[PDB]
């Protein structure tokens, strides 16, 4: 599968990220069992990336683009849209489905 987007709290419902814009997010990343492996919130610094530059996993590129500014949403991302068969040594196991809690704070 690809990425599933499930709403947590609504955004403005009008402003969606376009290619080339910088997305400013807080996020928490968990394995399928629920284990947290990464979180911008624990660092108390929002994470920024530019849509369309493949700075993030494909599930983020296609999933965050479906969110409106101010929305919090749950992205469930299959391995093909994530770290794949390889995963990430000691962080993300092979063939892992990941769950991201993502809040799109603003676009720059």
Which CATH number covers residue 20? Answer: 3.10.50.40
* Cα separation values, 45 from 24, 25, 32, 77, 103, Å: 10, 9, 24, 23, 13
Tell me, yes or no, if 83 is annotated catalytic: yes
Contact 100, 28 (CB under 8 A): yes
What is the DSSP secondary structure assignment for residue 27, as one 8-state letter? E
User: How many other CB atoms are there within 10 angstroms of residue 55's CB atom?
Assistant: 14
How many domains does the chain contain in total? 1
Q: Quick one: which H or E segment has residue 101?
A: strand 98-107
Which residue, 54, 53, 61, is CA-closest to 25?
A: 61
Residue in 16, 47, 81, 83 annotated catalytic: 83
- Whether 102 contacts 75, CB under 8 Å: yes
Active site annotation includes 81: no
CA distance linking residue 73 with residue 56, whole number of Å: 17
Q: Give me the catalytic one of 16, 49, 81, 100.
A: 100
Range of the domain at 20: 2-108
Compute CA distances 49 → 2, 17, 41, 44, whole Å. 20, 11, 16, 16
Method: X-ray
User: Choosing from 27, 47, 49, 81, which is the catalytic residue?
Assistant: 27
27 is catalytic: yes
Residue 43, classed as helix, strand or coil, is helix
Q: How far apart are CA 40 and CA 53, in angstroms?
A: 20
Show Cβ contacts of residue 105 under 8 Å, excluding neighbours closer than 6 positions: 24, 25, 26, 46, 69, 70
**Does residue 57 carry a catalytic annotation?**
yes
Contacts (Cβ under 8 Å, ≥6 apart) of 45: none
Distances (CA, A) of 82 to 23, 50, 101: 19, 17, 15
62, two tokens: 């296609």
> How much is the CA Rg of the chain, to the nearest whole Å?
13
Q: Of these residues, 57, 77, 81, 92, which one is catalytic?
A: 57
């Amino acid at each position: 599968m690809g990425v599933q987007v499930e709403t947590i709290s609504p955004g403005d419902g009008r402003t969606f990220p376009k290619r080339g814009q910088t997305c400013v997010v807080h996020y928490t990343g968990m394995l399928e069992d629920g284990k947290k492996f990464d979180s911008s919130r624990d660092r108390n610094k929002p994470f920024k990336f530019m849509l369309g530059k493949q700075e993030v996993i494909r599930g983020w590129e296609e999933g965050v683009a479906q969110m409106s500014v101010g929305q919090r949403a749950k992205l469930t991302i299959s391995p093909d849209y994530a770290y794949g068969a390889t995963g990430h040594p000691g962080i993300i196991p092979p063939h892992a489905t990941l769950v991201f809690d993502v809040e799109l704070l603003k676009l720059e």
